[PDB]
Design brief:
Belongs to the RNA polymerase beta chain family. The chain is of the alpha+beta class. It has one helix and two strands; from the N terminus they run ββα. It has a two-stranded antiparallel sheet. The radius of gyration is 12 Å and the shape is elongated.
Length: 36
């Protein structure tokens, strides 16, 4: 679900209003299983 990887800080849940006001991107993390 949309999260914020903010410098010198934790990754926390990003809601549309915050994204709108702090000029961030309402986007979520993409993860895949890598086989080797």
């Amino acid at each position: 679900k949309p999260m914020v990887n903010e410098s010198d800080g934790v990754t926390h849940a990003l809601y549309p209003q915050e994204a709108r006001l702090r000029n961030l991107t309402y986007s979520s993390g993409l993860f895949v299983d890598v086989k080797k």
